[PDB]
Amino acid sequence: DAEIVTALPVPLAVAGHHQPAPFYLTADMFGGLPVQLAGGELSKLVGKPVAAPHVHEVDELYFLVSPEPGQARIEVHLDGVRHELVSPAVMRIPAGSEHCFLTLEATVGSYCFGILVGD
Amino acid sequence: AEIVTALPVPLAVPAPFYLTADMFGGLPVQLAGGELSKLVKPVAAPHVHEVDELYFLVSPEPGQARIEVHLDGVRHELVSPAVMRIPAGSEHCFLTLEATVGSYCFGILVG
Ligand SMILES: O=C(O)C(=O)Cc1c[nH]c2ccccc12
Ligand SMILES: O=C(O)C(=O)Cc1c[nH]c2ccccc12
Ligand SMILES: [Fe+3]
Ligand SMILES: [Fe+3]
């Protein structure tokens, strides 16, 4: 009686996001999780932001990964300051900070995941 | 700005970690894994953790990655995208059957 979730992703609305964001871990799974995890492969998102600047009441981590280092690059806007992230990278967005990301470069198999940390 | 770029962190279980419990003043999860196209590896070692572990299997397009999860004497064949909970104490491991470049399995230890 293993617990398996395959009805994925779970689309959930997130502030300032044009479309519901694709979640792979949500806070209610498996009796309750201390994180939520959303994101996707970036190869078709180059130049196309998924959201306008937005604020969360929880910390969010951007996790940028690609098969080979350097194959993915995003620009993170953090309270009006721009930061370039190169795969592999993890960036913490403190709760209350206005932020969003723009994909600069991405191969097939490049991902950015946003990990909401449950406080 | 808090950015970590010295990644992955090899830790003994050695697994490549992208989130460790000490990052950013303390995290409630740890996250390890890697892309699967080079793991498609004839064997894999059963092991147990003291915390729950979630397998998160993804590929650029749905269905492009496939693993076998062995959990306490039962074999499970999972197709991307999939998430599977491995309860703390349960003997387990996974084997990659099929994976396009850019497929990942992450093991997420839930504190
Ligand atoms: O895989 C795609 O095409 C996406 O929609 C990616 C995506 C949507 N919302 C996000 C929030 C954080 C990281 C990636 C995404
Ligand atoms: O050894 C490597 O290069 C790996 O990719 C290890 C790995 C891939 N997926 C995982 C999930 C949980 C623990 C280790 C791995
Ligand atoms: Fe955000
Ligand atoms: Fe494990």
φ, ψ for residue A30, nearest 5 deg:
60, 35
Q: How many CB atoms lie within 10 A of CB B21?
A: 13
Residue nearest atom 9 in ligand 2 by C-alpha distance: B33
Question: Please, which residues have CB within 8 angstroms of residue B9's CB and are 6 or more apart in sequence?
Answer: B16, B17, B18, B20
- Facing residue for B82 by CB, picked from A6, A30, A86: A6
Q: Is any ligand 2 atom within 6 A of the Cβ of residue B105? A: yes
Known binding-site positions of B = 47, 49, 53, 92
Residue nearest atom 6 in ligand 1 by C-alpha distance: A40
A91/B2 touch (CB, cutoff 8 Å), yes or no: yes
What CA–CA distance (Å, rounded) separates B97 from A119?
37
A111/B29 touch (CB, cutoff 8 Å), yes or no: no
What resolution in angstrom units was achieved for this structure? 2.1
**Token digits for A5?**
């979730």
**Is A54 annotated as contributing to ligand binding?**
yes
Contact of A47 with A103, CB cutoff 8 Å: yes
Rg (CA), chain A: 14
φ, ψ for residue B18, nearest 5 deg:
-110, -25
What CA–CA distance (Å, rounded) separates A118 from A96?
14
DSSP A15-31: TTBSS-EEEEE-TTGGG
List, as ranges, residues with CB under 5 A of the ion ligand 4: B 53
Give the amino acid at A83: H
Tokens 């147990």 correspond to what residue? B48
Tokens 């076998």 correspond to what residue? B68
What CA–CA distance (Å, rounded) separates A86 from A108?
15
φ, ψ for residue A64, nearest 5 deg:
-110, 120
Residues of B in contact with A30 (CB under 8 A): 52, 54, 85
What CA–CA distance (Å, rounded) separates A93 from A29?
24
Beta bridge partners of A83: A76
Helix boundaries (H) for B1-73: none
3-state secondary structure of A101: strand
**Ligand 2 center to A106 CA (angstroms):** 22
What CA–CA distance (Å, rounded) separates B99 from B25?
35
What CA–CA distance (Å, rounded) separates A40 from A103?
12
Burial (CB count <10 Å: 0-12, 13-18, 19+), residue A103:
buried
Method of determination is X-ray
Contact of A99 with A116, CB cutoff 8 Å: no
Residue nearest atom 15 in ligand 1 by C-alpha distance: A39
- Facing residue for B102 by CB, picked from A37, A59, A108: A108
